[PDB]
Design a protein around this ligand. Structure first.
Ligand code: CLA
Ligand code: CLA
Ligand code: CLA
Ligand code: CLA
Ligand code: CLA
Ligand code: CLA
Ligand code: CLA
Ligand SMILES: CCCCCCCCCCCCCCCC(=O)OC[C@H](COP(=O)(O)OC[C@@H](O)CO)OC(=O)CCCCCCCCCCCCCCC
Ligand SMILES: CC1=C(/C=C/C(C)=C/C=C/C(C)=C/C=C/C=C(C)/C=C/C=C(C)/C=C/C2=C(C)CCCC2(C)C)C(C)(C)CCC1
Ligand SMILES: CC1=C(C/C=C(\C)CCC[C@H](C)CCC[C@H](C)CCCC(C)C)C(=O)c2ccccc2C1=O
Ligand SMILES: CC1=C(C/C=C(\C)CCC[C@H](C)CCC[C@H](C)CCCC(C)C)C(=O)c2ccccc2C1=O
Ligand code: SF4
Ligand code: SF4
Ligand code: SF4
Ligand SMILES: [Ca+2]
Lengths: 73, 154, 37, 31, 141, 70, 739, 80, 37
């Protein structure tokens, strides 16, 4: 998701979520101190890289361990 | 004219629409009379009102769908889960008021002030655990409540 | 679920501490820190 | 041969909209 | 300059308009002098009826005001080239932003000053080794 | 159900009801291909009288096949 | 009211040698290699070449004739391959046992093993398109009729090509002929749809009913009378149906009740051949013909009577809606993209309706028995429908960018919908997130409850059960329909709602599909993915004019990569990139929909039948308690059923294995274009230009990398190609292994 | 805010000033080119960093550069 | 006291609602209305 889609779509979506929080009646009490924006370009690249990496590592450490521990254990 | 949707509060450049859901007479007399919005209350009472309706319904999803519905300790596990949720809830909103209202301390609209939001946090905690314990006590003694609504203790 | 090892009473309180009590006060202290001025 | 619970709940739901319409009539008769 | 004279144009109301930043931090206001009662597309969303004479429109960002200024200067045969974009604070002060010199920035006039102009090529920029811990930038110094 | 004066009677009755309907509520009637005269009904014209006779037949098949099984 | 200009464009071959003449910036010269890609990116952008609304419309009309020639030569190829290189008369001799095959492979490199033994000694590749059952429904007997139909199709292909040249270079119509939209609408209603339905009703009465009647009796091939012999001798038609001795005369006196023996309302399926009744479909096409030609006289053209649509759109205005549809008649007759968006939306939903109707009411003889035909026809029409709906979301945005003039439509429905774009999208993504948690988090929850060894806390049927009560009540009404709310109907609309099990040739045609809690969860998965694709495409339509991030989006165009790295970053902000994201989301939505179809129909519907009444399915009823888990979708569906693609080497289903791996390759190749950006490849290609300049072989066409929109386009194209090829190979090899 | 630095390779073609939709660039007089004018960026606190001025410039490796520095409410382009 | 008819659970909650919950909020809304200015 972070690899294929890029920032400008998610910024246009976050504009609508900001509008919905600022016009919902009972959630006008709770307002953000920092203005919520989308993740930056190099930043969400790194986030998608991190998910690709730890996703790869976790599914292979699952398969490589369990297949040879099911065959020899 | 006969158009029912118009500009919000006269000026058409504020990003909102006066609408029969948004700015009807019934909406601005019901939302404007909700405890977080009606005028003439301290934030301790309006936090106590907001807390009671939140504590009273949080017993439900754990006494009917939680993991202790198998055993006979059904409502006790439901109460314990809801006390944990309201404790996390009042931790979140008291920390919110701890970090948002530091500084200029605006005078009017006393709910959005540090002493006001801390009064709201104390009210939400009292109403939250009280509504949770009342819904637990009325669910555990459900044979008593059924007996006094059917009238078989006479 | 029990403990055959020594001090089986100790993970009974250390698992909810590091699961709830440590991250709630860590996120509470960090959210107070990173949003202050 | 008697009624069922779903017929009673459907009667409540089909009578829910006269409550909204009488609320509309009462509101416009007040103003 | 300090007072905004104008009437609001005919518009039904939208959702992409002024959010809570307007009454808290800043907002913007474009004022122009129309010729007829034509139709213009505001960058907030949808179309609006431009009133006759001097009219005033409140927007939330400066980019929407300059996009409206581009729409006023290109997409009309009576080319409206006498619009003024102000910045309005919630304190009440009004800052004249564009075309504050008086003439458009596309053409040159005497009275401006060369701010942010270098006297070298980009290939003549210094290297980031000689200023590695000065705290400055390789383009500034 | 076959050829009879009963089915033709209800056909002609609902047909002329449809001619009166077209003479009452069609917005623009006359401006088409002109009829030779106004002797039939109204001031319809060729395309307009073909339309209201066809609606007479649509209404005809409606009540006839709605009464042939009832 | 015909307005034709004479000889607008001279016919000449000299323009063919100058590529790129249609656009102003392409006819100058190929200074750069990106011009080549621009030559294909603007070849059909007829609104960017001409800007007068008259040249583009006749260009569209002649392009329609050229595409019609492409469809006619494709249909000619189908009938020619069914004539010469098939076994249609052999399959017609024995439809239950042997399998159809309409493609023989030349043995050159060892691919003669693809010509598997399909039954009867004939070798070839077994077809899954299932147009053999179409031909048996139409009434084809021998290969010579298919050959002459292919010849007549090629004749009409050359006829449509000549009509395209005639209507662009000889006699091209004017703009008022195209803008006669009420005449176009009622001619297409009556003379195209209704008159074509009446033609097929006549063919189903005269040809398709008697041939299929005596074929259901058991008459062998080379013993059926020729289809014209029933018209040449009406006694051969009157001995099959008693109403044909009554002649035309009961039709005109409204004595239609005597036609009841051959225009029936049976419904259900035919128990002999496993398809729809041909008398039922003949009565059906006749009724559609009558209703369409009745509705084909609604719009006034020349004779006063009729509805001009302008005051229809004027008359619909309410309190919420302001001025109503005031201006839409001027929009839809002056902009082809709005018409393209509406027509692609409704043709896409029509094609999905076609898929969702051609599996529970199988209209062809011996179609429900062949599981490969049923599965392939379902999923292919699902994919075509989803593609066309994404194209609706594209051309809506193109209408917003380049065909939307805001001065003409003030306070109408288009202006009012663009005025509250936030109040639409901020609720659409809320219901996207609510459906996302409540359709996927249910799957994660009972995956975790099964992995933690507690099956009593899952969302199964024995566990906390989410019974879909609404569709179960609707199935009860459809089962109770014939006799109470459809008294002249014998069977139901289908046997998928409720009824008996239809068995034809030892297999199951259609049995009632019960809906447990697994169908509840997967239908909410379907509604979730439909909502997200209808979020990306709708917020590509509404946010194509301007926004609060970038309010200058209309002047930048419809197809631009970004506004720049400022404002945090504005890449993929155009109306094009929402189509680029919606294409993946259509891929994900339709992949889960056809997975739910394939698994539910081969676990609860298909399988062999036994003479004592018991039904054994293909996967022995796995969808009940094992379709509620992600591991259940992986182990019992994607691992267990892919074994027929895996272990099929040295056999007839051997090309599907090297299309399985091929589709995995094109998916993985798409990731290079999707993940990387242009400037890396530009910085690398310029080094290869250095290595060419060292040997004086650097081309004078300047070689440089693809555009950013081009990189995203080739990424989404190879992704959708690789995923659909993988699913095509898996579905075909599995359902050909199971029979 | 970002830093818009304009080098001496500018030929005074004023394409960058009419391309920037925020009114930060403006033409000041100069004596180093044929047009005798050079672009200049005084209002750099309003520049969002969109680099639309670095798409319409004719020199080799365009004479105006936008170095993306700090961010604020204006430089991130937020209407909330 | 029970119910032999269908939906015997329903008067068990509708009798206290129309007895207490309806008149308390009706008198509360009316006393707020008739004493306001
Ligand atoms: C998002 C989907 C989803 C859903 C619906 C559930 C649902 C459930 N999970 Mg669960 N779970 C999920 C995802 C989900 N899970 C995921 C992703 C994980 C991690 C892998 C888990 C891990 C997990 C564990 C480990 C366990 C559960 C358990 C449960 C059950 C009881 C939990 C409970 O009391 O909730 C409490 C919820 C609330 C207090 C929130 C209530 C929200 C209310 C209803 C919203 C009301 C809105 C209102 C109607 C709108 C109108 C308001 C006003 C205007 C009128 C319940 C059936 C437990 C169990 O025993 O299973 C049977 C259990 O032990 N879950
Ligand atoms: C990593 C640590 C961790 C641990 C230890 C647990 C532990 C638990 N989870 Mg859980 N969970 C976790 C992470 C964790 N979770 C995460 C990361 C997720 C998100 C995926 C979830 C999502 C999840 C769901 C969805 C559900 C659980 C549930 C449960 C409980 C099952 C039994 C039960 O109903 O308890 C009963 C409830 C409690 C014991 C709550 C604690 C209340 C304590 C007893 C009160 C103590 C407060 C006291 C006054 C203060 C003391 C001060 C201190 C300084 C001494 C169990 C206590 C289920 C449940 O019902 O929990 C409510 C359930 O439905 N979990
Ligand atoms: C009742 C007469 C009639 C009929 C039968 C048709 C039939 C058709 N028109 Mg058409 N049209 C008509 C009157 C009619 N039109 C009038 C009066 C106008 C002017 C208002 C138009 C204006 C018009 C346009 C502008 C276009 C069509 C197109 C088409 C084709 C649609 C899809 C297709 O190729 O089908 C498959 C083919 C067939 C079913 C063959 C049937 C026709 C045979 C040759 C007779 C179809 C052949 C479209 C087209 O060019 O498609 C190629 C198209 O773009 N028509
Ligand atoms: C476009 C469609 C079409 C065409 C070309 C024909 C053509 C024909 N039909 Mg026919 N028919 C049709 C639709 C059509 N039908 C439909 C929809 C019905 C059902 C109402 C019938 C019911 C029908 C009957 C009952 C009979 C014909 C007969 C005939 C033939 C006699 C010629 C004549 O004037 O009639 C002729 C070949 C007659 C026949 O059998 O002659 C061979 C005859 O008896 N038709
Ligand atoms: C009725 C159908 C229809 C029609 C007439 C159009 C017409 C148009 N579309 Mg379009 N479109 C449609 C459906 C349709 N579309 C659908 C269903 C989608 C969703 C996928 C799109 C998505 C789409 C996009 C995203 C864009 C257009 C654009 C355009 C315009 C220019 C076309 C162009 O340059 O392409 C010329 C032709 C090509 C580039 C050929 C494409 C080749 C594809 C990618 C590969 C085919 C794969 C093949 C099937 C597999 C085998 C190949 C190999 C393995 C052997 C033109 C008006 C463009 C536009 O208006 O830009 C301003 C534009 O950017 N369309
Ligand atoms: C498998 C990867 C993946 C996942 C999970 C998602 C998930 C989502 N995408 Mg998405 N996307 C993906 C790949 C993925 N995408 C790819 C490859 C593309 C490229 C084309 C896109 C393009 C895309 C677009 C264009 C859009 C989305 C949107 C969305 C959101 C829709 C809302 C929803 O489903 O409810 C939320 C569901 C989930 C988060 C998944 C459920 C997981 C569990 C229940 C939650 C975890 C439980 C708990 C929190 C754990 C606690 C542990 C504790 C320690 C934290 C959702 C977050 C849309 C959006 O955001 O607006 C609505 C949107 O517009 N996506
Ligand atoms: C018309 C409606 C009505 C109804 C249904 C009742 C019902 C009842 N009356 Mg009663 N009463 C009424 C009118 C009514 N009365 C009138 C008009 C008078 C004046 C003449 C009286 C005078 C009267 C007296 C003098 C006495 C009763 C008593 C009783 C109760 C007998 C059993 C008992 O002790 O309950 C036990 C008490 C209760 C059930 C009280 C209700 C507490 C509930 C369970 C708590 C729920 C609150 C919850 C937190 C909020 C939920 C929010 C909601 C939105 C869901 C019974 C509940 C006797 C009694 O002891 O009642 C206290 C009694 O001595 N009544
Ligand atoms: C559902 C209610 C319904 O269909 O109302 C549709 C309602 C139609 O408004 P009017 O009654 O003014 O419509 C007259 C129209 O026929 C003219 O286009 O418009 C809406 O309220 C928009 C919100 C739809 C989303 C409702 C949430
Ligand atoms: C009608 C309606 C509605 C509403 C609904 C709902 C949602 C409701 C809710 C309800 C609820 C949710 C209720 C609740 C209640 C609660 C309560 C009533 C509570 C109480 C509590 C208590 C009684 C407690 C006490 C205590 C104790 C015991 C001890 C501790 C402390 C304290 C003191 C706190 C709506 C909006 C839709 C709209 C219109 C109509
Ligand atoms: C989804 C998405 C977003 C939206 C991302 C958002 C709105 C961030 C929301 C993050 C939520 C709050 C989850 C974060 C919590 C995670 C579990 C991480 C924990 C926090 C760390 C500090 C540990 C982008 O901004 C984006 C930008 C560029 C390319 C692709 C994308 C992209 O795919
Ligand atoms: C590889 C790559 C390139 C480089 C792309 C290149 C060099 C295109 C390669 C085309 C070559 C010439 C192959 C030709 C394409 C077809 C095979 C042509 C068919 C020819 C046969 C019919 C004979 C980009 O430009 C790019 C841009 C943006 C994001 C990602 C990427 C990206 O990943
Ligand atoms: S990363 Fe590419 S698409 Fe995104 S803003 Fe930068 S140049 Fe534009
Ligand atoms: S576009 Fe480049 S050359 Fe032209 S004025 Fe601006 S900086 Fe100078
Ligand atoms: S980055 Fe954008 S705002 Fe800044 S100078 Fe360049 S064009 Fe103007
Ligand atoms: Ca339990």
């Amino acid at each position: 998701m972070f690899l294929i889609s890029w920032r400008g779509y998610w910024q246009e979506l976050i504009e609508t979520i900001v509008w919905a929080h600022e016009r919902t009646p009972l959630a006008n009490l709770v307002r953000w101190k920092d203005k919520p924006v989308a993740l930056s370009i190099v930043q969400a690249r790194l986030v998608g890289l991190a998910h690709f990496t730890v996703g790869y590592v976790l599914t292979y450490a699952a398969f490589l361990i369990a297949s040879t521990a099911g065959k020899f254990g | 004219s006969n158009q029912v949707v118009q500009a919000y509060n006269g000026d058409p450049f504020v990003g909102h629409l006066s609408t029969p859901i948004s700015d009807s007479a019934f909406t601005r007399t019901f939302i404007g009379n909700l405890p977080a919005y009606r005028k003439g209350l301290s934030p301790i009472l309006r936090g106590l009102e907001v807390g009671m309706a939140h504590g009273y319904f949080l017993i439900g999803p754990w006494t009917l769908l939680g993991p202790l519905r198998d055993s006979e300790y059904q409502y006790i596990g439901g109460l314990i889960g809801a006390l944990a949720l309201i404790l996390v809830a009042t931790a979140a909103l008291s920390s919110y008021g701890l970090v948002t209202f530091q500084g200029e301390q605006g005078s009017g609209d006393t709910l959005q002030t540090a002493d006001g939001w801390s009064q709201f946090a104390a009210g939400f905690f009292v109403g939250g655990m009280g509504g949770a314990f009342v819904a637990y006590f009325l669910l555990e003694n459900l044979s008593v409540v059924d007996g006094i609504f059917r009238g078989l203790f006479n | 679920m029990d403990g055959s090892y020594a001090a089986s009473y100790l993970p009974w309180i250390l698992i909810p501490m590091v699961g709830w009590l440590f991250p709630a006060v860590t996120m509470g202290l960090l959210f107070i820190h990173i949003e202050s001025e | 041969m008697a009624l069922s619970d779903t017929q009673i709940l459907a009667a409540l739901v089909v009578a829910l909209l006269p409550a909204f319409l009488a609320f509309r009539l009462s509101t416009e008769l007040y103003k | 300059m300090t007072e905004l004279s104008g009437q609001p144009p005919k518009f039904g109301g939208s959702t992409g308009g002024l959010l809570s930043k307007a009454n808290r931090e800043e907002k913007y206001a474009i004022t122009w002098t129309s010729a007829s009662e034509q139709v213009f597309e505001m960058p907030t969303g949808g179309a609006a009826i431009m009133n006759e004479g001097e009219n005033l429109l409140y927007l939330a960002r400066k980019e929407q005001c300059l996009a409206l200024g581009t729409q006023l200067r290109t997409k009309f045969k009576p080319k409206i080239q006498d619009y003024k974009i102000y910045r309005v604070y919630p304190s009440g002060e009004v800052q004249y932003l564009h075309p504050a010199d008086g003439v458009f920035p596309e053409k040159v006039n005497e009275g401006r000053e060369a701010q942010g102009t270098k006297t070298r090529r980009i290939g003549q920029n210094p290297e980031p080794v000689t200023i590695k811990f000065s705290g400055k930038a390789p383009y500034e110094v | 159900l076959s050829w009879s004066p009963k089915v033709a009677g209800v056909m002609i009755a609902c047909n002329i009801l449809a001619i009166a309907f077209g003479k009452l509520t069609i917005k623009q009637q006359n401006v088409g291909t002109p009829m030779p005269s106004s002797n039939f009904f109204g001031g319809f014209g060729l395309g307009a009288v073909l339309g209201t006779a066809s609606f007479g037949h649509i209404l005809g098949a409606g009540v006839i096949l709605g009464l042939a099984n009832m | 009211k015909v307005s034709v200009d004479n000889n607008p464009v001279p016919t000449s071959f000299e323009k063919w040698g100058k590529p790129g003449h249609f656009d102003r910036t392409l006819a100058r010269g190929p200074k750069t290699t990106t011009w080549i890609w621009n030559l294909h990116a603007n070849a059909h952008d007829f609104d960017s070449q001409t800007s007068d609304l008259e040249d583009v419309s006749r260009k569209i009309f002649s392009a329609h004739f050229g595409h019609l020639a492409v469809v006619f030569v494709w249909l000619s190829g189908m009938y020619f391959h069914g004539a010469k290189f098939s076994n249609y008369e052999g399959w017609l001799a024995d439809p239950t046992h042997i399998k159809p095959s309409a493609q023989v492979v030349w043995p050159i490199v060892g691919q003669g093993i693809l010509n598997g033994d399909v039954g009867g000694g004939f070798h070839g590749i077994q077809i899954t398109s299932g147009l053999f059952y179409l031909w048996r429904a139409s009434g084809f007997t021998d290969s010579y009729q298919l050959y002459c139909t292919a010849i007549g199709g090629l004749v009409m292909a050359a006829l449509m090509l000549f009509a395209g040249w005639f209507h662009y270079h000889v006699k091209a119509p004017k703009l008022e002929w195209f803008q006669n939209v009420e005449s176009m609408m009622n001619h297409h209603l009556a003379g195209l749809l209704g008159l074509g339905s009446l033609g097929w009703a006549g063919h189903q009465i005269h040809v398709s009913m008697p041939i299929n009647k005596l074929l259901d009796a058991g008459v062998a091939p080379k013993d059926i009378p020729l289809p014209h012999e029933f018209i040449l001798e009406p006694s051969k038609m009157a001995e099959l149906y008693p109403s044909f001795a009554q002649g035309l005369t009961p039709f005109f006196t409204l004595n239609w009740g005597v036609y009841s023996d051959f225009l029936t309302f049976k419904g259900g399926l035919n128990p002999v051949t496993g398809g729809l009744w041909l008398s039922d479909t003949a009565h059906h096409h006749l009724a559609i013909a009558v209703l369409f030609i009745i509705a084909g006289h609604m719009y006034r053209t020349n004779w006063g009577i009729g509805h001009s649509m302008k005051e229809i759109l004027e008359a619909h205005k309410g309190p919420f809606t302001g001025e109503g549809h005031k201006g839409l008649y001027e929009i839809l007759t002056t902009s082809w993209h709005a018409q393209l968006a509406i027509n692609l939306a409704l043709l896409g939903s029509l094609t999905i309706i076609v898929a969702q109707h051609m599996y529970a009411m199988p209209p062809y003889p011996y179609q429900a028995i062949d599981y490969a035909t049923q599965l392939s026809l379902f999923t292919h029409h699902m994919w075509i429908g989803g593609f066309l709906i994404v194209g609706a979301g594209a051309h809506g945005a193109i209408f917003m960018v380049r065909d939307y003039d805001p001065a003409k439509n003030v306070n109408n429905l288009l202006d009012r919908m663009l005025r509250h774009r936030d109040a639409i999208i901020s609720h659409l993504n809320w219901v996207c997130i609510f459906l996302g948690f409540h359709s996927f988090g249910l799957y994660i929850h009972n995956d975790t409850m099964r992995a933690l060894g507690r099956p009593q806390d899952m969302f199964s049927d024995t566990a906390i059960q989410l019974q879909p009560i609404f569709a179960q009540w609707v199935q009860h009404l459809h089962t109770l329909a014939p006799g109470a709310t459809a008294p002249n109907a014998l069977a139901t609309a289908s046997y998928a709602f409720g009824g008996e099990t239809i068995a034809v040739a030892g297999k199951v045609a259609m049995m009632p599909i019960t809906l447990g809690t697994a169908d509840f969860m997967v239908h909410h998965i379907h509604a979730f993915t439909i909502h997200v694709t209808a979020l990306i495409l709708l917020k590509g339509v509404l946010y194509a004019r301007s926004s609060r991030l970038v309010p200058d989006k209309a002047n930048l165009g419809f197809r631009f990569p970004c506004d720049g790295p400022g404002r945090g970053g504005t890449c993929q902000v155009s109306g094009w990139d929402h189509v680029f994201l919606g294409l993946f989301w259509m891929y994900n939505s339709l992949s889960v929909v056809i997975f739910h179809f394939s698994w539910k129909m081969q676990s609860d519907v298909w399988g062999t039948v036994s003479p004592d009444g018991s039904v054994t399915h293909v996967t022995l009823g796995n969808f009940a308690q094992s379709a509620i888990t992600i591991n259940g979708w992986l182990r019992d569906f994607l691992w267990a059923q892919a074994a027929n693609v895996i272990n099929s080497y040295g056999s007839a289903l051997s090309a599907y294995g090297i299309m399985f791996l091929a589709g995995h390759f094109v998916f993985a190749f798409s990731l290079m274009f999707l993940f990387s950006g242009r400037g890396y490849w530009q910085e690398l290609i310029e080094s290869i230009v250095w290595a060419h300049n060292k040997l004086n072989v650097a081309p004078a066409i300047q070689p440089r990398a693809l555009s950013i929109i081009q990189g995203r386009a080739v990424g989404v194209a190879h992704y959708l190609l690789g995923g659909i090829v993988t699913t095509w190979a898996f579905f075909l090899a599995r359902s050909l292994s199971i029979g | 805010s970002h830093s818009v630095k304009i080098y001496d390779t500018c030929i005074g073609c004023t394409q960058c000033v009419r391309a920037c939709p925020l009114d930060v660039l403006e033409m000041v007089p100069w004596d180093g080119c044929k047009a005798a004018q050079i672009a200049s960026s005084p209002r750099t606190e309003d520049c969002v960093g969109c680099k639309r001025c670095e798409t319409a410039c004719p020199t080799d490796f365009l004479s105006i550069r936008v170095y993306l520095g700090a961010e604020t409410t204006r430089s991130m382009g937020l209407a909330y």
